[PDB]
Amino acid sequence: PQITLWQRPLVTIKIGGQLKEALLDTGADDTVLEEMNLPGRWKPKMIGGIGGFIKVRQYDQILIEICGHKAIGTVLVGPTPVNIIGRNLLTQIGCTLNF
Amino acid sequence: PQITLWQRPLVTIKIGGQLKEALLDTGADDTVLEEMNLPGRWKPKMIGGIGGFIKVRQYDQILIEICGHKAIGTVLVGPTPVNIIGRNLLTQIGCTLNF
Numbered sequence: 001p002q003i004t005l006w007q008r009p010l011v012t013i014k015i016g017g018q019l020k021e022a023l024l025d026t027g028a029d030d031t032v033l034e035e036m037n038l039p040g041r042w043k044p045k046m047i048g049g050i051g052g053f054i055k056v057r058q059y060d061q062i063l064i065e066i067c068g069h070k071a072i073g074t075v076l077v078g079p080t081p082v083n084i085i086g087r088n089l090l091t092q093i094g095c096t097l098n099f
Numbered sequence: 100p101q102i103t104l105w106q107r108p109l110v111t112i113k114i115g116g117q118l119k120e121a122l123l124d125t126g127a128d129d130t131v132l133e134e135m136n137l138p139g140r141w142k143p144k145m146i147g148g149i150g151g152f153i154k155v156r157q158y159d160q161i162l163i164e165i166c167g168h169k170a171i172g173t174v175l176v177g178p179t180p181v182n183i184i185g186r187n188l189l190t191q192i193g194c195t196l197n198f
């Protein structure tokens with residue numbers, strides 16, 4: 001779809017049997033989601049944004065149905081205000097920035 | 100231009116006689132520029148991001164030439180680690196997301 005940016009670019013995802021709503025973020029190198037129940041092994045990791053750093057659980061190799069498109073990658077779960085899809089999955093679903 | 104997301108979507112801007120590089124960010128509602136010399140009257144403000152809030156100064160109707168395209172908006176200067184062009188200027192230069 002073509003998304004124009006007058007409103008936040010939100011899109012529905014299905015992760016872990018679960019229906020979520022996430023923000024399509026080109027200035028996010030990483031995918032970070034609010035605390036949720038996810039099956040598996042996780043590593044601790046820390047990431048920065050403006051304001052500073054949060055600790056997150058890097059889950060590796062999680063399938064995500066991003067707007068009907070399946071992708072598999074590293075998903076970080078942690079105490080974010082909004083669910084963020086970062087360029088590690090945006091390149092998977094073929095997303096480009098156009099102006 | 101069409102920009103893919105294999106690397107950070109960086110672009111050159113010219114703000115106030117100064118040449119800089121900024122991150123074209125759909126997940127940013129606002130444009131926050133690293134500390135710099137802007138002429139003007141600013142108001143304080145606090146913006147939020149993932150690791151907390153920071154205090155930034157709001158300077159309104161600042162011309163920015165983003166990749167040769169001119170736009171005039173509200174720019175916040177403050178302690179960001181990266182310069183960020185957010186959806187308040189991205190919609191101005193005609194930027195859309197596509198997949």
Ligand SMILES: COc1ccc(CN[C@@H](C(=O)N[C@H](C(=O)NCc2ccc(OC)cc2O)C(C)C)[C@H](O)[C@H](Cc2ccccc2)NC(=O)[C@@H](NC(=O)OCc2ccccc2)C(C)(C)C)cc1
Pocket residue numbers: 025026027028029030031032046047048049050081082084086124126127128129130131145146147148149180181183185
């Ligand atoms: C509601 O709050 C939100 C809304 C969205 C987010 C998601 N992130 C964005 C971001 O912070 N957006 C800000 C925003 O729109 N916030 C809404 C907002 C809320 C309240 C408000 O009050 C008036 C004003 C506002 O504008 C703008 C201002 C930068 C940007 O996409 C933001 C831009 C940036 C880039 C690099 C370094 C620092 C900042 N991106 C990041 O924070 C991303 N950071 C980044 O990619 O580096 C990651 C990393 C570091 C170290 C080791 C491993 C990885 C990431 C953490 C999401 C992956 C977080 C919180």
